[PDB]
Amino acid sequence: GRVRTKTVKRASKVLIERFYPKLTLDFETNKRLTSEIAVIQSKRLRNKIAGYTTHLMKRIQKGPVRGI
Amino acid sequence: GQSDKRELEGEVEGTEDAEAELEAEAEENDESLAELELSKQE
Amino acid sequence: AILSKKKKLVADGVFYAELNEFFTRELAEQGYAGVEVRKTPSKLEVIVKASNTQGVLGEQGRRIHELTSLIVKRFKLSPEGIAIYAERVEERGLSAAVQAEALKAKLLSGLPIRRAAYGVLRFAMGAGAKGVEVVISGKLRAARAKSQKYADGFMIHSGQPTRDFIDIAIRHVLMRQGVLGIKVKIMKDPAANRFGPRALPDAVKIAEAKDEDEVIPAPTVKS
Amino acid sequence: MLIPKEDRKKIHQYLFQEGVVVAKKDFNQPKHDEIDTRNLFVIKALQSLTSKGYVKTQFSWQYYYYTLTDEGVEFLRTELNIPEGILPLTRLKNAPAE
Amino acid sequence: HKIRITLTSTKVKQLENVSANIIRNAAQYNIVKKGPVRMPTKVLKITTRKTPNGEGSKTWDAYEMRIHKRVIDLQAPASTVKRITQITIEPGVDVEVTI
RNA sequence: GGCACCACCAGGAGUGGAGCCUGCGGCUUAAUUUGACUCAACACGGGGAAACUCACCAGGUCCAGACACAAUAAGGAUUGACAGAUUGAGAGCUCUUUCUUGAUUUUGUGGGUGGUGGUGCAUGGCCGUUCUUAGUUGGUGGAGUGAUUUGUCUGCUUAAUUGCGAUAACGAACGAGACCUUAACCUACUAAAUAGUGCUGCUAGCAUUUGCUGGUAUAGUCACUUCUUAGAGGGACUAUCGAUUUCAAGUCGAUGGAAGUUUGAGGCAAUAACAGGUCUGUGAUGCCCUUAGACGUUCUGGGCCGCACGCGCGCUACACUGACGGAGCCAGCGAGUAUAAGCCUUGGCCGAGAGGUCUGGGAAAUCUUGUGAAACUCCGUCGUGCUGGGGAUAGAGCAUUGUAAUUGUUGCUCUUCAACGAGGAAUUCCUAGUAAGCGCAAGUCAUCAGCUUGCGUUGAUUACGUCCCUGCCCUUUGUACACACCG
Ligand SMILES: [Mg+2]
Ligand SMILES: [Mg+2]
Ligand SMILES: [Mg+2]
Ligand SMILES: [Mg+2]
Ligand SMILES: [Mg+2]
Ligand SMILES: [Mg+2]
Ligand SMILES: [Mg+2]
Ligand SMILES: [Mg+2]
Ligand SMILES: [Mg+2]
Ligand SMILES: [Mg+2]
Ligand SMILES: [Mg+2]
Ligand SMILES: [Mg+2]
Ligand SMILES: [Mg+2]
Ligand SMILES: [Mg+2]
Ligand SMILES: [Mg+2]
Ligand SMILES: [Mg+2]
Ligand SMILES: [Mg+2]
Ligand SMILES: [Mg+2]
Ligand SMILES: [Mg+2]
Ligand SMILES: [Mg+2]
Ligand SMILES: [Mg+2]
Ligand SMILES: [Mg+2]
Ligand SMILES: [Mg+2]
Ligand SMILES: [Mg+2]
Ligand SMILES: [Mg+2]
Ligand SMILES: [Mg+2]
Ligand SMILES: [Mg+2]
Ligand SMILES: [Mg+2]
Ligand SMILES: [Mg+2]
Ligand SMILES: [Mg+2]
Ligand SMILES: [Mg+2]
Ligand SMILES: [Mg+2]
Ligand SMILES: [Mg+2]
Ligand SMILES: [Mg+2]
Ligand SMILES: [Mg+2]
Ligand SMILES: [Mg+2]
Ligand SMILES: [Mg+2]
């Protein structure tokens, strides 16, 4: 399965509560953005966090999401 | 220390050894050819 | 003689393994921590790290002099080709080798485990370790053998980071009733790591919001 | 042990004058490389000295590390009949290094 | 001369620092260089049984020893090349110079 | 309730049936050393034992019994010994025999020491297993007098206590995941005479059209990094779009993509636990036993292989989707030496072979080596026949290793050519470069691989589901158990 974990779900939604205007709907742009926002030790996790933040951002434009 | 004592004591007694030893050792840190005689047989 | 690249580097490792064990049995009473083999031109610098550098370089540095001669004579080294130095352990509380022998030296003195065990739990934390866990296994005035774990602070167990932030020391303790086996697992604080990673892989440090400034409609400040 | 008197001597002017001796644990080796006698003689000769507190014995990786105690130097002073003519070599006080 | 320097070690960062530092020192000094040449790394593999005894499921350890070898050719007199070796001494990497 | 090819379904390959290899039991034995007995004992102790190994058996040596004493002792305490006898032995082991050495040493006391001797039911360490299943824990808050409990859950989802969600809980930690190694991508960087290429010198063969195949080239003092190597990075996050879902976690399809099963595979791996196995790995160990006619150690010879029998891991096969006979001819993982005690070994020459010999290269991306491997493919012979399938058992002969091959170490030649005609009840492993074949390298190794650890070549059928069997996990429940049902 492709179930994201808690270290990525809570870390992804904290990005939204603090840096929503600078965020976007593009994974490539978000992945580059998160390299200067969070200190992530590994590249795969940076892409994983940015890939879930983009999914949440894409979902907020359809209405308010819970926990952010 | 399976007794009700010595884990109570063992705990408080364990800490006075180390706490005394970091400081004691931190004090330790503050002051930061014999065959010649047989050749004389010549 | 003529030795291959594969067979020389393994031999260099074997030389390290045998030399280090020589110091562990001989310098057990002086809190021997580890040995560093620094190759250099025309000399072979070896740095031994021990809690007590008085037991080694004692009585006019006789032991270190009488100890460097035993290595030239066993490895066929030129008398000038090796130089041995004795160095103090920087953080005695964070070195599990010193802590296990010291614990062994306390258990061997008849001291109770809790005063002795909590002496390494608090000494490790007092030095600033992120976590520490001690297992003592063996027989004590009873025919049946037992083991006890003493944890403290934060300890990680799985994956590569255990290879980076944890050092381990196993010591057999020779008692009149049997053998006591001690394992002293000390996790150093990754923040203090100075060459490899300085944090755990899943530690995410999100920056703070730099916003909430006041924007005025549209001037330009020249110079 | 049956050691010839002369061969026992050579073991003593090597364990004195470089007062440490290393001997591999092989009993049938003809010559311990640095003391021209049987290798077995070196192990057993110093086993007597370590039996009466004249040498420390350490064993690691099938090798013997014999070192002469300060208490043993005075005894060889009287058996080799040497005078207090200097230090062996490991007591010459070359001093450590910093 | 044409002098070849052969570099071997178990860990690559210190070997590569020495490799880059010598080329760097071979750069401000106007010395023509060839390298570094990366030899195929050698994986020294030893596969033992886990059990000291012979009981349990037959489980095996697989130990490894990476050996990396690089050779750099420098075209300079032997006196010049040798003093670079002592400037760039690193404990892990051993150096042999052959003409 | 849930999960799982060490469970099943749909299937594949099989095993169990034969011969033989090997391990175990049994029987035998002078000894046939021993540990292990469901999974988690039985090609396992890296255990492929001629000697050694070795612990077993029949015999024979040595002290390598330190050290404090006491005795003896220079008018010599004691050690080696030619020759004959003795012995398996050119062991002065011992006996006749007198030489030699010289306080090292001989006898008693204590004390040692060494044990593949006993005890894994005294232990350390290590390892296996529950289990790599998904489980474990505290802070604050709520409940209870308390031990405790909630958090840790009806439901959905995932490989997962992993997430959505519900919520007297809130917010967290270990484990899982992250992490690390490896395999697959990079005409984008960095270079490479130990990698490769185009041009160019010089050069060969064939048709002459200026072309097609080569050799040579460590001075052509060339160019380049696609293939090759490896360091710094990039790249995938299920990306985009459709469906379903509490519109949540997610799942399934497409498109793009090197990669969309956690991208494939592994490494590490929690809290405790088992009288699980190892004192036969250790100069790791406590205690017990032995310690000079040894249970120490060593030498010679035998045994661990012994054969009415039962069982397990396997290898060959029962043929034609095949055997031979020629011909074609492609990998990947690796290893490799000196005054040794002898490494990988091309090339030439002998030899039917096995193998021998003479030279040379390589401590290695350089040489062995493109390891020109085998299945495989082509052309023939064979023609359903225990037949040219199968190659046991055995006779005779030739070489190799080794001090030593007898109870054939192994290889080669001719002859002999057995069961076996696809295997009962049962039962094992397995979902993609996977299964199955097919070989090769490394380990053991003086010699021997039907064994393991890996690697590549050819390359599928069938699910992609379930709790019917089997095992495990969770909840509820009962308990007179808590040394916890081996109660
Ligand atoms: Mg973790
Ligand atoms: Mg993990
Ligand atoms: Mg260790
Ligand atoms: Mg479940
Ligand atoms: Mg469920
Ligand atoms: Mg379900
Ligand atoms: Mg199981
Ligand atoms: Mg089954
Ligand atoms: Mg079936
Ligand atoms: Mg078969
Ligand atoms: Mg039997
Ligand atoms: Mg038997
Ligand atoms: Mg024998
Ligand atoms: Mg024995
Ligand atoms: Mg047990
Ligand atoms: Mg499993
Ligand atoms: Mg509470
Ligand atoms: Mg609970
Ligand atoms: Mg849950
Ligand atoms: Mg390239
Ligand atoms: Mg484990
Ligand atoms: Mg069992
Ligand atoms: Mg053991
Ligand atoms: Mg056997
Ligand atoms: Mg098996
Ligand atoms: Mg054929
Ligand atoms: Mg190849
Ligand atoms: Mg026939
Ligand atoms: Mg045939
Ligand atoms: Mg052969
Ligand atoms: Mg082999
Ligand atoms: Mg085997
Ligand atoms: Mg399924
Ligand atoms: Mg399903
Ligand atoms: Mg069921
Ligand atoms: Mg009832
Ligand atoms: Mg009761």
Short mmCIF file of N, CA and C in Angstrom, two decimals, chain C residues 39-86:
data_model
loop_
_atom_site.label_atom_id
_atom_site.label_comp_id
_atom_site.label_asym_id
_atom_site.label_seq_id
_atom_site.Cartn_x
_atom_site.Cartn_y
_atom_site.Cartn_z
N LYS C 39 48.65 6.01 10.59
CA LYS C 39 49.84 5.78 9.77
C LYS C 39 50.44 7.11 9.32
N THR C 40 51.77 7.16 9.26
CA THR C 40 52.51 8.36 8.89
C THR C 40 53.85 7.92 8.30
N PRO C 41 54.50 8.79 7.52
CA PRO C 41 55.84 8.44 7.02
C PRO C 41 56.86 8.19 8.13
N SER C 42 57.63 7.11 7.97
CA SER C 42 58.78 6.77 8.82
C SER C 42 58.42 6.58 10.29
N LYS C 43 57.14 6.42 10.61
CA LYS C 43 56.67 6.30 11.98
C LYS C 43 55.26 5.75 11.92
N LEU C 44 54.85 5.04 12.97
CA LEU C 44 53.47 4.55 13.04
C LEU C 44 52.81 5.04 14.33
N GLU C 45 52.19 6.22 14.28
CA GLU C 45 51.55 6.77 15.47
C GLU C 45 50.29 5.99 15.82
N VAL C 46 50.22 5.56 17.08
CA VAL C 46 49.09 4.82 17.65
C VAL C 46 48.65 5.59 18.88
N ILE C 47 47.39 6.02 18.90
CA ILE C 47 46.84 6.78 20.02
C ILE C 47 45.89 5.88 20.79
N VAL C 48 46.24 5.63 22.05
CA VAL C 48 45.44 4.82 22.97
C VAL C 48 44.67 5.77 23.86
N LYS C 49 43.36 5.55 23.98
CA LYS C 49 42.51 6.40 24.78
C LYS C 49 42.13 5.63 26.04
N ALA C 50 42.51 6.15 27.20
CA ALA C 50 42.20 5.48 28.46
C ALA C 50 41.71 6.49 29.48
N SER C 51 40.89 6.02 30.42
CA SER C 51 40.45 6.90 31.50
C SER C 51 41.63 7.35 32.34
N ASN C 52 42.55 6.43 32.62
CA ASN C 52 43.73 6.72 33.44
C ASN C 52 45.00 6.54 32.62
N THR C 53 45.65 7.67 32.29
CA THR C 53 46.95 7.76 31.64
C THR C 53 48.11 7.88 32.63
N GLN C 54 47.94 7.40 33.86
CA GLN C 54 48.94 7.26 34.91
C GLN C 54 49.41 5.82 35.04
N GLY C 55 48.47 4.89 34.95
CA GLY C 55 48.78 3.48 34.84
C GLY C 55 49.62 3.09 33.62
N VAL C 56 49.29 3.62 32.44
CA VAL C 56 50.24 3.55 31.34
C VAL C 56 51.53 4.36 31.48
N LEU C 57 51.49 5.68 31.37
CA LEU C 57 52.75 6.45 31.45
C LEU C 57 53.12 6.77 32.90
N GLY C 58 53.43 5.71 33.64
CA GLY C 58 53.73 5.83 35.05
C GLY C 58 55.19 5.54 35.35
N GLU C 59 55.67 6.02 36.50
CA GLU C 59 57.04 5.78 36.99
C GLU C 59 58.07 5.99 35.87
N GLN C 60 58.16 7.27 35.49
CA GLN C 60 59.02 7.81 34.43
C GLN C 60 58.64 7.23 33.07
N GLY C 61 57.34 7.06 32.84
CA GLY C 61 56.85 6.57 31.56
C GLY C 61 57.45 5.21 31.27
N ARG C 62 57.70 4.42 32.32
CA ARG C 62 58.31 3.10 32.15
C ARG C 62 57.38 2.13 31.46
N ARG C 63 56.10 2.08 31.87
CA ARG C 63 55.21 1.10 31.27
C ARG C 63 55.02 1.37 29.79
N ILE C 64 54.84 2.63 29.40
CA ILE C 64 54.67 2.87 27.98
C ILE C 64 55.95 2.55 27.24
N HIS C 65 57.11 2.84 27.84
CA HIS C 65 58.36 2.42 27.23
C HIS C 65 58.50 0.90 27.23
N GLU C 66 58.15 0.25 28.33
CA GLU C 66 58.24 -1.21 28.37
C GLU C 66 57.10 -1.85 27.60
N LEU C 67 56.10 -1.06 27.19
CA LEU C 67 55.00 -1.59 26.42
C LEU C 67 55.23 -1.41 24.93
N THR C 68 55.90 -0.32 24.51
CA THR C 68 56.23 -0.16 23.10
C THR C 68 57.30 -1.13 22.63
N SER C 69 58.18 -1.56 23.52
CA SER C 69 59.20 -2.55 23.17
C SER C 69 58.60 -3.94 22.93
N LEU C 70 57.52 -4.29 23.64
CA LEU C 70 56.85 -5.58 23.43
C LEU C 70 56.14 -5.69 22.09
N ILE C 71 55.96 -4.58 21.38
CA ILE C 71 55.23 -4.59 20.12
C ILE C 71 56.21 -4.58 18.96
N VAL C 72 57.36 -3.92 19.14
CA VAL C 72 58.40 -3.99 18.14
C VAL C 72 58.95 -5.42 18.06
N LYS C 73 59.02 -6.12 19.20
CA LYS C 73 59.61 -7.44 19.26
C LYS C 73 58.65 -8.54 18.82
N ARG C 74 57.36 -8.26 18.73
CA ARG C 74 56.39 -9.26 18.30
C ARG C 74 55.99 -9.08 16.85
N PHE C 75 56.04 -7.85 16.35
CA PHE C 75 55.67 -7.59 14.97
C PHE C 75 56.88 -7.28 14.12
N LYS C 76 58.09 -7.57 14.62
CA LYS C 76 59.31 -7.42 13.85
C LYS C 76 59.45 -5.98 13.35
N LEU C 77 59.07 -5.02 14.18
CA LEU C 77 59.16 -3.63 13.77
C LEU C 77 60.52 -3.06 14.14
N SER C 78 60.96 -2.10 13.34
CA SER C 78 62.18 -1.40 13.68
C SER C 78 61.96 -0.61 14.96
N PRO C 79 62.97 -0.50 15.82
CA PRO C 79 62.76 0.21 17.10
C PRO C 79 62.33 1.65 16.91
N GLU C 80 62.74 2.28 15.82
CA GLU C 80 62.35 3.65 15.52
C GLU C 80 61.06 3.74 14.71
N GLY C 81 60.54 2.62 14.21
CA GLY C 81 59.41 2.70 13.30
C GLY C 81 58.04 2.91 13.92
N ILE C 82 57.92 2.85 15.24
CA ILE C 82 56.63 2.97 15.92
C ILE C 82 56.76 3.99 17.04
N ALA C 83 55.71 4.79 17.24
CA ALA C 83 55.65 5.69 18.38
C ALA C 83 54.26 5.58 18.98
N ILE C 84 54.21 5.38 20.29
CA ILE C 84 52.97 5.18 21.02
C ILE C 84 52.71 6.39 21.91
N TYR C 85 51.48 6.91 21.86
CA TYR C 85 51.01 8.02 22.69
C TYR C 85 49.80 7.65 23.53
N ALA C 86 49.74 8.17 24.75
CA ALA C 86 48.61 7.95 25.66
C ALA C 86 47.78 9.22 25.80
#
